[PDB]
Design an enzyme around this catalytic site. Sequence first.
Site, PDB file in Angstrom:
ATOM      1  N   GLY A 142       0.843  -1.321  -0.056  1.00 65.10           N
ATOM      2  CA  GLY A 142      -0.118   0.062  -0.129  1.00 65.10           C
ATOM      3  C   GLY A 142       0.748   1.256   0.007  1.00 65.10           C
TER       4      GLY A 142
ATOM      5  N   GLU B 262      10.317   2.878   6.374  1.00 70.77           N
ATOM      6  CA  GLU B 262      10.239   1.460   6.588  1.00 70.77           C
ATOM      7  C   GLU B 262      10.956   0.896   7.713  1.00 70.77           C
ATOM      8  OE1 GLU B 262       8.094  -0.860   5.481  1.00 70.77           O
ATOM      9  OE2 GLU B 262       9.095  -1.939   7.190  1.00 70.77           O
ATOM     10  N   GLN B 263      10.285   0.378   8.742  1.00 73.67           N
ATOM     11  CA  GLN B 263      11.059  -0.165   9.823  1.00 73.67           C
ATOM     12  C   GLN B 263      12.049  -1.340   9.629  1.00 73.67           C
ATOM     13  OE1 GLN B 263       8.207  -1.810  12.849  1.00 73.67           O
ATOM     14  NE2 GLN B 263       7.334  -3.394  11.335  1.00 73.67           N
TER      15      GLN B 263
ATOM     16  N   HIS C 158      -2.966 -12.501  -5.130  1.00 72.01           N
ATOM     17  CA  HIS C 158      -3.987 -12.272  -6.229  1.00 72.01           C
ATOM     18  C   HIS C 158      -3.912 -10.865  -6.328  1.00 72.01           C
ATOM     19  CE1 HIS C 158      -6.191 -16.393  -6.364  1.00 72.01           C
ATOM     20  NE2 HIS C 158      -5.125 -16.363  -5.329  1.00 72.01           N
TER      21      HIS C 158
ATOM     22  N   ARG D  78       4.674 -12.755  -4.789  1.00 68.80           N
ATOM     23  CA  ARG D  78       4.435 -11.433  -3.822  1.00 68.80           C
ATOM     24  C   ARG D  78       5.632 -10.656  -3.620  1.00 68.80           C
ATOM     25  NH1 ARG D  78       0.223 -10.154   0.664  1.00 68.80           N
ATOM     26  NH2 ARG D  78       1.185  -8.302   1.520  1.00 68.80           N
TER      27      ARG D  78
ATOM     28  N   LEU E 297       9.012   3.993  13.197  1.00 70.07           N
ATOM     29  CA  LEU E 297       8.301   5.291  13.623  1.00 70.07           C
ATOM     30  C   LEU E 297       8.173   4.850  15.226  1.00 70.07           C
ATOM     31  CD1 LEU E 297       6.975   8.007  13.087  1.00 70.07           C
ATOM     32  CD2 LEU E 297       4.878   6.869  12.834  1.00 70.07           C
TER      33      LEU E 297
ATOM     34  N   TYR F 204      -2.379 -21.863  -5.860  1.00 70.66           N
ATOM     35  CA  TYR F 204      -2.341 -21.235  -7.198  1.00 70.66           C
ATOM     36  C   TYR F 204      -0.935 -21.122  -7.609  1.00 70.66           C
ATOM     37  CZ  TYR F 204      -1.727 -17.039  -4.408  1.00 70.66           C
ATOM     38  OH  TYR F 204      -1.687 -15.997  -3.214  1.00 70.66           O
TER      39      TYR F 204
ATOM     40  N   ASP G 299      -4.111  -1.873   5.359  1.00 69.71           N
ATOM     41  CA  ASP G 299      -4.479  -2.524   6.885  1.00 69.71           C
ATOM     42  C   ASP G 299      -4.606  -1.513   8.102  1.00 69.71           C
ATOM     43  OD1 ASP G 299      -4.687  -4.926   5.311  1.00 69.71           O
ATOM     44  OD2 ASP G 299      -3.171  -5.693   6.499  1.00 69.71           O
TER      45      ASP G 299
ATOM     46  N   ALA H  87      -4.511  -6.489  -0.002  1.00 69.18           N
ATOM     47  CA  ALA H  87      -3.554  -5.555  -0.726  1.00 69.18           C
ATOM     48  C   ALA H  87      -4.036  -5.045  -2.084  1.00 69.18           C
ATOM     49  CB  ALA H  87      -2.556  -6.503  -1.279  1.00 69.18           C
ATOM     50  N   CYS H  88      -4.901  -5.296  -2.460  1.00 65.76           N
ATOM     51  CA  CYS H  88      -5.803  -4.666  -3.509  1.00 65.76           C
ATOM     52  C   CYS H  88      -6.573  -3.524  -3.057  1.00 65.76           C
ATOM     53  CB  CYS H  88      -6.819  -5.595  -4.282  1.00 65.76           C
ATOM     54  SG  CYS H  88      -5.785  -7.010  -5.466  1.00 65.76           S
TER      55      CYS H  88
HETATM   56  C1  FAD Z   1      -3.368 -15.414   4.244  1.00 65.65           C
HETATM   57  C2  FAD Z   1      -3.638 -14.054   4.074  1.00 65.65           C
HETATM   58  C3  FAD Z   1      -3.793 -14.089   2.595  1.00 65.65           C
HETATM   59  C4  FAD Z   1      -3.981 -12.919   1.662  1.00 65.65           C
HETATM   60  N1  FAD Z   1      -3.907 -12.924   0.473  1.00 65.65           N
HETATM   61  C5  FAD Z   1      -4.218 -11.660  -0.508  1.00 65.65           C
HETATM   62  C6  FAD Z   1      -4.379 -11.874  -1.796  1.00 65.65           C
HETATM   63  O1  FAD Z   1      -4.314 -12.845  -2.401  1.00 65.65           O
HETATM   64  N2  FAD Z   1      -4.659 -10.559  -2.683  1.00 65.65           N
HETATM   65  C7  FAD Z   1      -4.523  -9.340  -1.911  1.00 65.65           C
HETATM   66  O2  FAD Z   1      -4.711  -8.338  -2.510  1.00 65.65           O
HETATM   67  N3  FAD Z   1      -4.647  -9.578  -0.375  1.00 65.65           N
HETATM   68  C8  FAD Z   1      -4.395 -10.452   0.443  1.00 65.65           C
HETATM   69  N4  FAD Z   1      -4.202 -10.582   1.633  1.00 65.65           N
HETATM   70  C9  FAD Z   1      -4.284  -9.107   2.318  1.00 65.65           C
HETATM   71  C10 FAD Z   1      -3.044  -8.423   2.237  1.00 65.65           C
HETATM   72  O3  FAD Z   1      -1.846  -9.208   2.547  1.00 65.65           O
HETATM   73  C11 FAD Z   1      -2.801  -7.199   3.216  1.00 65.65           C
HETATM   74  O4  FAD Z   1      -4.045  -6.564   3.018  1.00 65.65           O
HETATM   75  C12 FAD Z   1      -1.913  -6.013   2.640  1.00 65.65           C
HETATM   76  O5  FAD Z   1      -0.620  -6.356   3.033  1.00 65.65           O
HETATM   77  C13 FAD Z   1      -1.969  -4.966   3.440  1.00 65.65           C
HETATM   78  O6  FAD Z   1      -1.059  -3.934   2.599  1.00 65.65           O
HETATM   79  P1  FAD Z   1      -0.581  -2.689   3.687  1.00 65.65           P
HETATM   80  O7  FAD Z   1       0.430  -2.046   2.767  1.00 65.65           O
HETATM   81  O8  FAD Z   1      -1.653  -1.782   4.211  1.00 65.65           O
HETATM   82  O9  FAD Z   1       0.301  -3.067   5.006  1.00 65.65           O
HETATM   83  P2  FAD Z   1       1.287  -4.142   4.930  1.00 65.65           P
HETATM   84  O10 FAD Z   1       1.644  -5.088   3.998  1.00 65.65           O
HETATM   85  O11 FAD Z   1       1.102  -5.028   6.495  1.00 65.65           O
HETATM   86  O12 FAD Z   1       2.781  -3.336   5.122  1.00 65.65           O
HETATM   87  C14 FAD Z   1       2.962  -2.215   6.204  1.00 65.65           C
HETATM   88  C15 FAD Z   1       4.404  -1.774   6.031  1.00 65.65           C
HETATM   89  O13 FAD Z   1       4.605  -0.820   7.001  1.00 65.65           O
HETATM   90  C16 FAD Z   1       5.917  -1.322   8.104  1.00 65.65           C
HETATM   91  N5  FAD Z   1       5.633  -0.953   9.194  1.00 65.65           N
HETATM   92  C17 FAD Z   1       4.881  -1.379  10.244  1.00 65.65           C
HETATM   93  N6  FAD Z   1       5.106  -0.586  11.234  1.00 65.65           N
HETATM   94  C18 FAD Z   1       5.758   0.315  11.050  1.00 65.65           C
HETATM   95  C19 FAD Z   1       6.276   1.344  12.009  1.00 65.65           C
HETATM   96  N7  FAD Z   1       6.115   1.703  13.383  1.00 65.65           N
HETATM   97  N8  FAD Z   1       7.313   2.174  11.425  1.00 65.65           N
HETATM   98  C20 FAD Z   1       7.823   2.022  10.212  1.00 65.65           C
HETATM   99  N9  FAD Z   1       7.190   1.095   9.420  1.00 65.65           N
HETATM  100  C21 FAD Z   1       6.160   0.067   9.796  1.00 65.65           C
HETATM  101  C22 FAD Z   1       5.765  -2.549   7.822  1.00 65.65           C
HETATM  102  O14 FAD Z   1       7.131  -3.305   8.265  1.00 65.65           O
HETATM  103  C23 FAD Z   1       5.300  -3.151   6.330  1.00 65.65           C
HETATM  104  O15 FAD Z   1       6.303  -3.060   5.828  1.00 65.65           O
HETATM  105  C24 FAD Z   1      -3.909 -11.644   2.592  1.00 65.65           C
HETATM  106  C25 FAD Z   1      -3.672 -11.450   3.879  1.00 65.65           C
HETATM  107  C26 FAD Z   1      -3.840 -12.727   4.547  1.00 65.65           C
HETATM  108  C27 FAD Z   1      -3.389 -12.837   6.003  1.00 65.65           C
END
Ligand code: FAD
Length: 353
Positions: free
Chosen positions: A11, A30-31, A43, A104, A126, A201, A271, A284-285
């Site tokens: 994201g 990034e941490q 996906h 991924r 952070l 898959y 998230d 992730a989408c």
């Molecule tokens: C089993 C499972 C299967 C999934 N399959 C899919 C799929 O097929 N297709 C799809 O679209 N989604 C899928 N998802 C959902 C997807 O993985 C998450 O929604 C996605 O990772 C969210 O992205 P994000 O960027 O919001 O957060 P994250 O991916 O969690 O990235 C957050 C980033 O912020 C960093 N960070 C965290 N805290 C700090 C801090 N204090 N300071 C600095 N940096 C920090 C983290 O290290 C990380 O790198 C799945 C989830 C699960 C559990």
Amino acid sequence: QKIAIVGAGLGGAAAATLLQQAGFDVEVFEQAPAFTRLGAGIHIGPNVMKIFRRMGLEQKLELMGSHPDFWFSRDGNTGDYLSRIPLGEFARREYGAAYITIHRGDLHALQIEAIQPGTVHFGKRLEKIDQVRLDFADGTHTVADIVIGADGIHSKIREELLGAEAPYSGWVAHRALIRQHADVFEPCVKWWSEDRHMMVYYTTGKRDEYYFVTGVPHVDSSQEEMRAAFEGYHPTVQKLIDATESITKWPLRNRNPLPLWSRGRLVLLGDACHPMKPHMAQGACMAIEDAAMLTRCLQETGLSDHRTAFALYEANRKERASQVQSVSNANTWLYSQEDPAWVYGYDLYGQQL
Ligand SMILES: Cc1cc2nc3c(=O)[nH]c(=O)nc-3n(C[C@H](O)[C@H](O)[C@H](O)COP(=O)(O)OP(=O)(O)OC[C@H]3O[C@@H](n4cnc5c(N)ncnc54)[C@H](O)[C@@H]3O)c2cc1C
């Protein structure tokens, strides 16, 4: 005028790329001490491939990913076909882009490499939040005019805004990559039973690597654990378990809080914003959709008017986020032969703000 993004996940990296390509001054913090290519598949639906299209990454992703003709839902115990969701060329023509499953880690690396070099900083955890000051665990600090919280389910931005959040995980996801049984391994299939499932898959167009992720009532796992967990599933599933070399097991939350979109100079995506159970596997989408919409809104208002941008962003995302929430609550996504157009044909860039 400066944008700081906390978190270089899918994201946050997408937001960085879209916002820099829109001509904004952006840095990402990034941490993690280093970048890791997750050994997992993901996906990516047509609705998000159109966003990668704006980044200039769509063609590369098509070369890398597997393009399943169908999503099959199958009964775990019998192998009966519960749904045969047409993808492939039909998806391309009906939804306006490919449906892919992809490695991924390699997607994630490509996404970060789209950010301007020297603007992504690792080892910057952070620890604390006119302007916003960010304090990092390594003792350094930075300042920005707005801050984007893309720091995932354990968001520090969310915590700084709302406080500690009450504490539990009674289910896990097993993950494995498999590298003799190719005749019975379909490119995109979800095996369902009453209280658990396995999603399987290919990660690439080469189809030399086959990934499963589960959801099961409940570190390294083992084949003995998998066999007990999937006692009674179709021979194809047993062959997958038997073909594994290393299995890892990941805890999934039993609940999540309600969406937090923005407060003051802080705005949230993915998230961090709207955590939910991964039933639909579109999180992730949704994070990348958040990034694209947020960028459209900041493009309308400029950074000088972040309050209006954040209001438009929530207004143009909250219904779709809420639809995904309720469908994932039902846990019926593609379990039966349903029309997925409302997800995959969604036109993020055509929405009037
Ligand atoms: C089993 C499972 C299967 C999934 N399959 C899919 C799929 O097929 N297709 C799809 O679209 N989604 C899928 N998802 C959902 C997807 O993985 C998450 O929604 C996605 O990772 C969210 O992205 P994000 O960027 O919001 O957060 P994250 O991916 O969690 O990235 C957050 C980033 O912020 C960093 N960070 C965290 N805290 C700090 C801090 N204090 N300071 C600095 N940096 C920090 C983290 O290290 C990380 O790198 C799945 C989830 C699960 C559990």
